[PDB]
């Protein structure tokens, strides 16, 4: 039921296989819907619902914005290298921005990082920038002195971003608001019991192991929930038990596609 729009920007000084000099990825509720890179040089759809709902002008404008960003990010890499008095080498510049829509209230953020460490972030409430170190303090002064940067970002995050999110959620409703039931299998080795849930949506899920109906929280090991190729998800929970206690254990799976939590035995 909550919703988010995210843009992920990555520039590198030394590109490599699968890592172009500059990439922008857009995502809605954690699903990638648009992408641009310095090689294709155009914003391109990554899901059906976006192409079916926007005009050519949308693509032209996103492409134009991204072509300009590419140049900005190249300069950021040069400037950062000079600020930290670094020699030529492999470096990364990243920015992330987005907005959240949840239960009447909205959230927004804009943050940049250099070589995978914080550099600068917008404080939307005070319209100032939070600098991570002395190098970033120079950027803080520049952006704040400019006098419209923070304001433009607040406007974007609180209005434009949210307006487009609402549109995107509407365009992708059949995808984004659907429910798909996990297919669950229990396994065992030696005894390690494994409860695997396949193909569920949305991503929130709770997989627990029960001994005679009793939740074994301290004993339950869990993976991170991970995507399948079709936009469904995968999660697992395991437990170590004595091979004689096998039949005391059940896996409980709570999920929005399940009116009641599912219970599974090996």
């Amino acid at each position: 039921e909550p919703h988010s729009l995210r843009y992920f920007y990555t520039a590198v000084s030394d590109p490599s296989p699968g890592v172009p000099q500059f990439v922008t990825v857009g995502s809605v509720d954690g699903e990638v819907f648009v992408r641009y890179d310095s090689e294709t040089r155009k914003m391109e759809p990554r899901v059906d619902w976006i192409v079916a709902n926007v005009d050519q002008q949308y693509w032209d404008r996103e492409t134009e914005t991204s072509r300009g960003n590419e140049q900005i990010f190249r300069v950021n890499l040069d400037t950062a290298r000079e600020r930290y008095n670094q020699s030529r080498g492999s470096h990364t510049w990243q920015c992330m921005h987005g907005c959240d829509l949840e239960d009447g209230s909205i959230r927004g953020f804009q943050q940049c990082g250099y070589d995978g460490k914080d550099f600068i972030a917008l404080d939307k409430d005070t319209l100032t920038y939070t600098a991570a170190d002395a190098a970033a303090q120079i950027t803080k002064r520049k952006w704040e002195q400019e006098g419209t940067v923070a304001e433009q970002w607040k406007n974007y995050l609180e209005n434009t971003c949210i307006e487009w999110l609402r549109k995107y959620v509407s365009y992708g409703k059949d995808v984004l608001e659907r429910r798909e039931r996990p297919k669950v299998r229990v396994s065992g080795m030696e005894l390690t019991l494994s409860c695997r849930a396949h193909g569920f949506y949305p991503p929130p899920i709770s997989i627990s192991w029960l001994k005679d109906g009793v939740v074994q929280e301290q004993e339950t090991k869990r993976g991170s929930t991970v995507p399948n190729s079709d936009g469904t998800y995968h999660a697992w929970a395991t437990i170590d038990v004595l091979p004689g206690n096998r039949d005391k254990y059940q896996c409980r799976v709570e999920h929005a596609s399940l009116p009641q939590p599912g219970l599974f035995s090996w």
């Binding site: 922008t24 857009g26 900005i72 300069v75 434009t160 487009w164």
Partner: peptide, 9 residues
């Protein structure tokens, strides 16, 4: 959609 008119550090 992307914010326009971005700025260098």
């Amino acid at each position: 959609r992307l914010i326009q008119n971005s700025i260098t550090i």
